[PDB]
Amino acid sequence: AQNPNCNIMIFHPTKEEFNDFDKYIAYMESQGAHRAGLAKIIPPKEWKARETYDNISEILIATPLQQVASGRAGVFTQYHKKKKAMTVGEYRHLANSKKYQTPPHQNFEDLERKYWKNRIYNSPIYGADISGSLFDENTKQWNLGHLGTIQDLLEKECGVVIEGVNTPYLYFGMWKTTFAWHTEDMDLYSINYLHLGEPKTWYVVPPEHGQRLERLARELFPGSSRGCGAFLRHKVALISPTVLKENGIPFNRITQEAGEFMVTFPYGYHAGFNHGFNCAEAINFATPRWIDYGKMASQCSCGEARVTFSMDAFVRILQPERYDLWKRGQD
Ligand SMILES: O=C(O)CNC(=O)C(=O)O
Numbered sequence: 001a002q003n004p005n006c007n008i009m010i011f012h013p014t015k016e017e018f019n020d021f022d023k024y025i026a027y028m029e030s031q032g033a034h035r036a037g038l039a040k041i042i043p044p045k046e047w048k049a050r051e052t053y054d055n056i057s058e059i060l061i062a063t064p065l066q067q068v069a070s071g072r073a074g075v076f077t078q079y080h081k082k083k084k085a086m087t088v089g090e091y092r093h094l095a096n097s098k099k100y101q102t103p104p105h106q107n108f109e110d111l112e113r114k115y116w117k118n119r120i121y122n123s124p125i126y127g128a129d130i131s132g133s134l135f136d137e138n139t140k141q142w143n144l145g146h147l148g149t150i151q152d153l154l155e156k157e158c159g160v161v162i163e164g165v166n167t168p169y170l171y172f173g174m175w176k177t178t179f180a181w182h183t184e185d186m187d188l189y190s191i192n193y194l195h196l197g198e199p200k201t202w203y204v205v206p207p208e209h210g211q212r213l214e215r216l217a218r219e220l221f222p223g224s225s226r227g228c229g230a231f232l233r234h235k236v237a238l239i240s241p242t243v244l245k246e247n248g249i250p251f252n253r254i255t256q257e258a259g260e261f262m263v264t265f266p267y268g269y270h271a272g273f274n275h276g277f278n279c280a281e282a283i284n285f286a287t288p289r290w291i292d293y294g295k296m297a298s299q300c301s302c303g304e305a306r307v308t309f310s311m312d313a314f315v316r317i318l319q320p321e322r323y324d325l326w327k328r329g330q331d
Pocket residue numbers: 171178179190191192264270280282283
């Protein structure tokens with residue numbers, strides 16, 4: 001078995017290997033990459049996502065989210081308070097302000113220590129889930145707006161034709177902006193490209209050990225667990241590396257820099273934070289190996305997680321028993 005310790009693998013495809021997306025994903029899995037739940041892909045040196053970022057300040061963040069924490073430094077939840085709209089230019093200037101900017105630090109490790117010590121005491125503002133793309137239409141390789149769609153994958157593998165579309169989303173971050181512990185909707189893959197700015201630190205639990213993280217989360221967030229049998233789908237809970245180590249949960253960490261892709265694999269729980277002002281683009285995708293994970297994916301039916309139009313069909317086809325109850329939650 002390849003990669004039996006479930007380490008995060010880093011890939012360096014040549015320009016030739018960067019032509020066929022599906023094939024390269026299947027290659028990385030042949031080497032065991034998926035066992036970690038997360039992989040990094042460094043593009044060939046010839047490749048670029050677009051020519052410059054010189055003209056992005058006019059993108060609108062219609063509903064910036066202030067991420068307010070509650071709890072203790074290593075075990076907390078966050079709620080998102082909606083703020084008034086602002087442009088990317090306005091947000092970048094806010095991120096760089098004295099109140100929100102990255103503090104002085106020695107290296108990524110010192111900054112990681114400062115994040116876990118001090119996150120809860122601040123409320124950074126995140127522009128998340130903004131439909132759109134920053135890839136130039138002429139970028140033909142690994143263009144996250146030109147991938148094969150999940151609906152077409154399900155049709156190719158299973159024969160069934162379904163409604164729905166699959167488009168990318170932009171994320172504008174600042175120091176301390178935080179992504180809570182989660183897997184993807186329907187335990188899909190994700191791919192995330194860091195277009196510009198400061199790094200993103202990731203934490204991930206191997207898919208084969210995901211239920212260990214779930215059991216710890218039920219112990220650490222006991223009222224949330226009583227409320228919903230899949231409350232990590234709410235994307236609100238944080239648990240630090242120190243707390244994971246104290247509780248024996250297997251995990252790995254890695255820092256993504258501008259110009260790099262990350263892939264998350266089905267049922268790979270992940271969380272993380274941004275180091276400073278940045279912009280990322282991400283989208284879900286599927287392969288043949290995902291289908292079985294999609295059939296088994298948990299679902300939030302308490303009504304909090306409230307998700308896309310396209311998830312309907314996935315539930316209806318892959319989880320017809322749950323259909324009914326999940327759509328009671330979704331209405
Ligand atoms: O970059 C972010 O804030 C969060 N992204 C993801 O969880 C992802 O790509 O799967």
